[model samples]
Target: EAAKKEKVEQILAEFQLQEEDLKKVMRRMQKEMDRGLRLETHEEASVKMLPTYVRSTPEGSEVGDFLSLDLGGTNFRVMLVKVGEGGQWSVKTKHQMYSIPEDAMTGTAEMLFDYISECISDFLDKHQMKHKKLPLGFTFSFPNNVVGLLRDAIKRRGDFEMDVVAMVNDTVATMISCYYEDHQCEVGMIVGTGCNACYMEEMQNVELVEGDEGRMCVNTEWGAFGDSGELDEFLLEYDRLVDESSANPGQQLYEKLIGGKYMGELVRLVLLRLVDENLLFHGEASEQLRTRGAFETRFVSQVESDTGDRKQIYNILSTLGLRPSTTDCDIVRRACESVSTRAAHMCSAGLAGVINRMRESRSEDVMRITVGVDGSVYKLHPSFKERFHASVRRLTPSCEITFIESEEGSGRGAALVSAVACKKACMLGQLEHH
Candidate 1:
């Protein structure tokens, strides 16, 4: 009892934050959302809010056959999605996902995508169908830094691959897939190994010609939203530690805060801090927590989902060379919950700001909307969806909104974008020929 009480006080003093701190962080994040909107319109803004020129989203009526090429953090995938009866969709079983080789990513960018392309070729051969060209949708979600044909890479690959009709981020793809499947989908958000969002907006708000009379789906590559100057004292704790040690320091700072790829690692630092304060493991040590990138987001999920008895909590600490009592389990759970709660809260707040910005300007539209999402954090995390929606609802209760989970949305979304590209191309052809 003595040690447990002592450790409890120690952990709370170090990690337990005041409401003021949480409020500060949340308000700052909302301000950054406004800044992101500015960055989109004003080239004068700090971050380069890129205009992707996508100009469209799935309208729940597209039909076609599209070959989706997905190269993400996990796998290089190629799947054929056929838009089906009344805008339904499915991936042909002939598709394949090649585990991206550890060497290929580091060795050569060209090797990585070519190895990817060959995998697609195999799918074509297996399907035993011949087409003059395949409508290609490249659903890429990586630490990409690309343009054009994509022959050897994401460029114009010498005109032989296929009609590279469209390329979209996984976030956008999620929206498209869900929109086609369900008419209610209006925004798409990603909160997995990475983070971003896409939604339909009028041409005017997205910096297009006045009175263009078009609704374009804007890919707010929002993970790269905040700039380095925005880092204040409140953000310095886990965020600065994780970022400075990263290979590309100061890059993807917002992602470092919230993205799944780095969140567990961030929690690792928090645990190490507890250890340093002589609270956790009863003043013992942790080899696993000490190691960099050793902890994963799944571990965070495991800790949070520990239903009070906390057997997984004990298992996690034991594997890391810690002696976890009930008090220790409680401590770890709080830490994981705090981090995830903040992330989920931030996602909704930003979404609200974006939706609000895209709507209220009078000339704008898409007010009452539902978001389609695909990602581990948003899909798999138990508390994330609840916390996110709760926050959004509190902020904007009148907002008519729902969230849909689009499984394998990347592949399906690519095909949808390809259909859009093909339609646009046909329209262009008719104009040119006339």
Candidate 2:
């Protein structure tokens, strides 16, 4: 045991890390799990004001007909949904791909909303769903604070520099998607390009840190919860450097490590660092490796697909715009393997943290925690699901945690929220009449 401990210490020294740093990483994972669990139990823990819509198992609620719109960073989509009695529903959707105009991306709130409204109008004309009084669900994927059943204030912490689009979060829109003329659905979730969760709860119980209240819904900007603890030394450096360079600096550390936008880059940074130290490729000085973010994550796919050479490392190097005169692909393959392994492990820690939190809040028998995961990284990365599942199993040996695939992307989730707001209005009217 002493010999094993010494070898571990030696490795940590080589990596410029301490045992404490590793412990901190584990602690952070625990915190995240705890947070997720708490959110499941206490709606106030959610950042967005989303009503947890419960679908009856034997027969679902009848939500009637509605339109759903999903707006993403790279594309716009629309869906028409009809919920029958019970939770049974049918949906049809269409999408268009367009780069958000540069000005629109950085414009005032009015300009952004106007553009969005115009898009909606155009879509209605194309689909011929005009003047139907069909309630719409809008999925807004950006971070924000939910103020009401259909309103939110942007957190102003992301790549988009637009004015606040009030009255929407991704999941709230999905809730709206279940709306009929007389009935409404009460939850929305975003499961695309990136990850975030939101829901509605009583404003009084929402334990606002400061300067936030008077709202029923909370936008849980869960990504920002990263780095809530002292980080591993390597993670600290990695986070600091990434934040110093990111559009939203010094925030969302864990998200940066795991989200699609930065996971590939993280892998790249680690490999380049190894190259700088001559720990890879038998000390081959490959100049092309100096550039950053040059190798796309598609390269990961390449690694998984290759079956020809035992040393397919050369294939990776070549993909990174490097060329070698020899056939020793082993080193390159190993480098990819190392980076991916680290990413998977780190992600597992984060998931574990979420699960741990859930276990703390509700009884294991009654608590059915559903994590609505979004983002291309989680959906597209070959090893992400396996890693995430393993982490959950390790963290919650006796509890059940389900990762539900959200049907509506963030934008659609937002649109659904509008319909939900209208439903609340009708309910209030009925109460007043009574």
Candidate 3:
């Protein structure tokens, strides 16, 4: 037992991040963020801080009924959003989920888009609104002409007519969705199947864009944050293995370390090492453990959330063909905790870099800000939110932050963007008439 304990200690040491290590990470991240923002260095920087062109958040004066479509997640969603003004403002939304089959995901572009059009057709029929031509807000990527393909598909299907309004990605949509709840939300983050963040930036600092006026939303494609070898020190052997085995190897380096898609694999690698060292499962590793992705990421959350005498961990390990003894359960739990804790800290370091930049941009000694956050890892994991919030606070001592979890941020946020566009155009028309 003592020998096993020594081995466990040695393995856990690799994942440990002391306060100074976290501080250094925060500094490096800030340096990269600065590099990404500069015109000269932007081309080579790993973090491509692209301008979003979204200049303002909702002003609570937007009133309209709009349709919203959200894609690029676990499933596709279509929504009907009604925005109205009373004493304050209100947005009511009803949405439906459509699962993407394997063929649709891997097939030709027409097949995928035709499937989307069919889903929209069904949604319109269910809502009894086939006769009206409502404006639609799409939450995804691709050029404006991609919407043309969708429009053509809709017309080909001979279904209802709808106008495509403004488009916003999920991160910006999350920020807009949260802004409706609290006006202070200027940053959006996702920590789900993938991880990324977006925030409002001073136009003067956004050298890539034309205007130097107010703030514009910058989509800090931070998933690629460490592709330039900035995170080489923090990357473990397990992380390298995960990266080598991924579809896009040597890419999304920072995301491979922190995203939910890779966490379970990291834990699996740790368990495999322990078994090879005769420290777990009586030195015998199961075939399932050797297989890639056999230990799902959700298992890490389940193992860590165990409150009783390691029963939960035992059950989960057993399913993975690991007949874990009590000590084995304890070891697995500790490994999960260490990996998850490191992820939270790393994510916090990057977020701290962002909040600190926001503070410095405004030249404020103290700043109060709200961050709109979404994704399964940030919300579902028991300790992630607390760990993330605490570490962010410790790293950014000058900022007071409110973390608001976004509900249906993609669909609802798209609708809100459409409403904002109409509101702006109406005001502009009135000004022109005068």
Candidate 4:
């Protein structure tokens, strides 16, 4: 028993992080954003600050018929958004769950896009269409190197025949969809298999793109938020283990810390260390866990949800070939909670940075700030939002903010972007003639 106490102390020491640490990172993040907006360094965080060309999340009541292609996360979804009286939105038709081939993901850009072409071809043949030349809004969830807007015929098609009008990041789409439905929604966040965020910025701040508008949505690509001196000295050996093993090592640094893709693996490493000291599973290591990333984020969510998992003790223990015991369950739960809380705390820091930056510069009246967060880690992890909210309040009490659930941002938000783009072009064409 004394040996066990020693083991806990050693493990806890490796993972100790406090609110002060988070606050320091928060200050660094604020600086990173300022630099990006100034177009100083493109490497750190790459805070694209790219213009989305849409000034505001629609009033939810504008009427329109548009096509949207959403390849957000691992899921490929197709949605035909019907915008009716009072900016109401409805999916008149939808086809989802299409998947990209593994080989294509690493093979060739052409191969990947060709796969996209085929998917659209099939969608056009199957779905009934109201317009022969519908405008398209593309919601690509991943970070992109965008210019002006995005897509073509290789980017377009037949029957459902369409033209690309606007391109929106998954996060930007979330903000748009949420704002359309909830006027207070001003930010879009994704804390899932990956993490990222976006928000509306006054057009002048987005020097990366050409546009003349009072406001435009900006994609932060925040997962790339590191190298700005925000992460050094903060990483532990467990974090290094995951980074070294990840497909894109030394990249997505901030993402790996908080994303669903890597957090569970952090727990796996810690358990392995504990087992080596004979502190867990009677000091026996599980074969399955020896391999990297065997235990996924779902496992963490499950364990965290259990809140010590006393009832699911044996069941949870069995997966790692361990005999169930109250002690083991408690240890596992604590590790999970601690890791998750760190992520939640760190997330709040980023959010607070953005909120404070916007607020500090504003002398005009500002309503409450709102973020529309999507993704499995945030939605499924019962405590993620609560922890995030608590930290946000602690760090930025002067800023009123709310984190809300938003669905289908990658799909429907693209459709709305299409309408906005087409409207802009029409107004431009008339102005040129006049």
- The C-alpha TM-scores of every prediction are 0.73, 0.58, 0.82, 0.76
| Model 4 CA deviation exceeding 4 Å by range | 43-46, 57-65, 69-131, 138-160, 164-167, 210-213, 307-309, 364-367, 407-434
Please report how far candidate 3 places residue 96 from its true position, in Å.
10
- Per residue, candidate 1 scores C-alpha lDDT tens digits across 1-434 of 68755665554444343445545544555455445445353543433334444455433233356566667777767777655544334434336777966666535666656666656666776785335455565665553433243444523233244555434566666776787677767688888999888777666655533345677666666675455455445464778888788877767676666789987987788778777777777666666678998888998988888887889888988887777878778888877887887777656656766666555644334457778877888877779888888876666544667777765543554556555554444433421211
Best by TM-score: 3
Judged by TM-score relative to the true structure, which candidate is superior, 3 or 4?
3
Off by over 4 Å in 2: 1-66, 70-135, 139-205, 208-219, 226-229, 232-240, 281-287, 308-313, 325-328, 364-366, 406-434
lDDT of model number 4: 0.69
lDDT pick, better of 2 and 4: 4
lDDT of 1 at 317: 81
Q: Could you tell me the lDDT of residue 162 within candidate 3?
A: 71
Q: What would the TM-score be for candidate 1 when compared with the true structure? A: 0.73
Model 1 residue 305 lDDT?
82
Whole-model lDDT values for every prediction: 0.64, 0.47, 0.82, 0.69
Per-residue lDDT over 76-139 for candidate 3, one digit per residue giving the tens place of the 0 to 100 score: 7788887776555577889898888776653666777788889888898899877766666566
User: Which structure is stronger by TM-score: 2 or 3?
Assistant: 3
- By TM-score, the better pick of 1 and 2 is 1
Error at 373, model 4, angstroms: 0.6
In model 1, the clashing pairs are: 148-155, 148-156, 149-155, 149-156, 149-157, 150-153, 150-154, 150-155, 150-156, 151-157
